[PDB]
Ligand binder design. Structure first.
Ligand code: AOO
Ligand code: ZN
Ligand code: ZN
Lengths: 453, 453
């Protein structure tokens, strides 16, 4: 057993929203056994000094595109709207791949770096949505991301993605990226069989993740609806990015939500990325259907899209999680940092009603329990007996946090660095003193850097 | 002499916006001797390895309220409008002060912490506007802040502030903080005499900083305009916060700008904080007058105020700098971090015109050369021969910056941490390997923390 002793603040996000001061967390294998003051060290083989730290459930990034780690801070993509951006990303990746510079082996190392960054940022679970499958067969890109994740020990969901609707029939994408629906479906069956760990504390899970309504055939959505029910896995896609509604109207004469409903995706198996601009009238429908939403403040701002109606979602009882999206539209994997963006950027939308603004605790909740609920993980996102020992802690005693009165608010509103001090995943200590304990930081940086096209 | 050799990237912000790759910076005493490739280590007594770093001019925070470091992350002040905010801050400060908990000795140590954080964030010059002068006689609060700055070796401007218009006569300021105009003028003359270093590379400078049009008598603005001419010092105040226009109309029947023009402040001696909501038709007048503007994205968002027309200011040729404001409305002193906030938050105002969005380079210029210009420092903000050796460097080779293609954009758009690697002020190395060279960080944290009310 591992005991973390004397934590300055513990934020549980349990059913009573308990917080604790000068308290401990006891860990046994993959699970938390207790959270409380003065815990017994009866069967403890390692005690860790938590004094001066705040502990949270591990952050859960409910929407990544790991392969975009290779596409950060490209000058031509700095100030572009969505259409120019998407063309630029697809063209570059197709180009690099054609030149033998962007195969699964490269993606493995890009994923390794972004996932290691994730750990160092206090993120203990990542859900990646990979759609890049050039060629006549589905290559081992997902396997590569899973290999990277398992090597590091980070908890991992892979939402296999695609672009199955070609520009020829209304899609905004070139037929290079277009796979036949059956190829995608066949591949997903194999991935579930090979990799999916459905048991509590499972470390790898597969989800089914079409790129979206403007990008994938209705047939794929329906196939995935059937597959998700048959294999009890979850469903993920992009949702109400601006312009989606125009494309859905043109192709189908219905809204993106009506499309999802029609093809089996109005269900509690589903989590939806962005949800920036839904018709206000559909929000109660999202609630009744039990879909979950991941707030992605950084890309929404970066693309000029604006502010998703998160307060409205919370008012409606809709599950809200948080994510970063890929590093071509962020351009980092810093989830904690993005929370500050949301905390501040939402405010000018309601200048005279501060009670509507998202709070630090609401945001931290989204990034832990909310994201856990998005991923369908009742075993994560909460520091309590019986849940997974996924824990992230930050030091409170730096010169840049002097004068902080509330440590949880302080974690979002102050600081020069979002680097976690101590990070535990599945009961395994992976970060200590802001450094990886098992991963070779310098070698990983060197190896991945050598592979960036 | 000191040679920084082999910097991966150097951003000069010189008159041709030169950048250099794999280049050196040579320093002699307080000044830069040369910037370029393979510089001679002739009289060099020390060579610093710059490989893997990006170098910029030191960041210059053109608007601080250091004493607010003690008022961070207060739950009751997390989500409040300006009115409630001002109420909460003035009550706490006056209340702590009355109880002997907020004297110059406390402010000295709060300033010491925030200024040390500033150095660690790559900030080499700070302009503080101390707003708390309880009792008719302003204590040695300004002396306290200067003492802290000089102990640390950070370059420092102290804008002596005031609240000369009391509510006892149609003003908005409590009588506890209201000083007779001549008393303020006299304190200012005493400060210039004791502290002001007008020579190039001067490390302490005095500025004259009324709280604002709603808060100070016309006679003070005029007296200051006179002092500014007499002593070649600069003038600083708050400008076009929401509600100012109404307060100005109510008291004087004219706009805040019209009022400044009337009382001698429409000149190239002036820099103005926020400038969030000016009438568009006055912008050309700002340009003609030659006033400079400090953009403060964090408090503007935190208060729910929204987006200052920065693109318009740049279009008009108006000098634009950057600052954080005080830590009661931020709540950090992390200037680099705030640049990312600006980079993203401005975009949704112009969804379809990305050319209007502020670029990384425009924002970094604001935080260096722009801020130097605000402060009237032609000796700062540029990495070139003859300017001050104020330099801030960040490492580029961390796992969180793998895949970055343009290091300057990457400084804004990526990272778990804004901590600077190497910081030089006045030719003195003050931060190296992300650690203070001379300052005792642990002792400073302990001492200041003990004094937080
Ligand atoms: C195409 C629908 N949306 C979308 N897709 C991505 N990424 C992939 C191309 C990997 N990133 C964003 O960021 C906003 N939006
Ligand atoms: Zn996405
Ligand atoms: Zn201010």
């Amino acid at each position: 057993m591992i005991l973390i002793r004397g934590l300055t603040r513990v934020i549980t996000f349990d059913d009573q929203e308990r917080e604790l001061e000068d308290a401990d967390i006891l860990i046994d294998g993959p699970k938390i056994v207790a959270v409380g003051k003065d815990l017994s060290d009866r069967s403890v083989s390692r005690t860790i000094d938590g004094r001066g730290m705040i502990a949270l459930p591990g952050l859960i990034n409910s929407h990544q595109h790991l392969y975009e780690g290779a596409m950060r801070a490209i000058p031509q993509l700095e100030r572009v709207t969505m259409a120019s951006w998407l063309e630029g990303v697809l063209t570059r990746s197709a180009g690099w791949w054609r030149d033998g510079k962007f195969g699964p082996d490269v993606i493995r190392e890009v994923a390794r770096a972004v996932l290691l960054e994730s750990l160092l940022g206090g993120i203990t679970t990542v859900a990646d949505q990979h759609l890049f499958f050039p060629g006549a067969t589905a290559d081992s890109y997902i396997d590569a991301t899973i290999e990277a994740a398992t090597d590091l020990g980070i908890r991992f969901h892979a939402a296999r993605s695609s672009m199955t609707l070609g520009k020829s029939e209304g899609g905004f994408c070139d037929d290079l990226f277009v796979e036949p629906v059956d190829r995608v479906v066949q591949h997903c069956l194999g991935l579930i069989d090979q990799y999916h760990e459905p048991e509590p504390f499972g470390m790898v899970r597969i989800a089914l993740g079409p790129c979206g309504v403007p990008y994938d055939k209705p047939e794929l959505f329906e196939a995935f609806a059937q597959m998700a029910a048959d294999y009890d896995v979850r469903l993920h896609t992009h949702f109400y990015q601006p312009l989606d509604a125009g494309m859905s109207d043109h192709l189908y004469g219905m809204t993106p939500w009506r499309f999802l409903e029609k093809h089996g995706w109005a269900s509690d198996r589903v989590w939806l990325a962005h949800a920036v601009v839904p018709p206000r009238e559909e929000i109660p429908e999202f609630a009744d259907a039990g879909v979950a939403i991941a707030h992605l403040i950084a890309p929404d701002l970066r693309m000029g899209w604006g502010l998703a109606p998160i307060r409205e979602y919370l008012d409606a009882g809709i599950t809200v999680g948080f994510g970063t999206t890929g590093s071509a539209s962020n351009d980092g994997g810093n989830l904690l940092g993005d929370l500050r963006l949301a905390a501040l950027a939402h405010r000018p939308a309601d200048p005279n009603e501060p009670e509507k603004w998202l709070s630090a605790r609401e945001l931290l909740r989204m990034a832990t329990r909310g994201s856990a609920e998005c991923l369908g993980r009742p075993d994560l996102g909460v520091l309590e007996e019986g849940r997974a020992a996924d824990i992230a802690c930050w030091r409170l005693d730096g010169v840049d946090r002097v004068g902080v009165h509330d440590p949880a608010i302080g974690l979002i509103m102050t600081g020069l660095s979002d680097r976690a001090s101590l990070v535990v995943v599945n009961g395994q200590v992976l970060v200590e003193n802001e450094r990886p304990v098992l991963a070779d930081l310098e070698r990983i940086v060197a190896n991945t850097t050598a592979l960036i096209p």
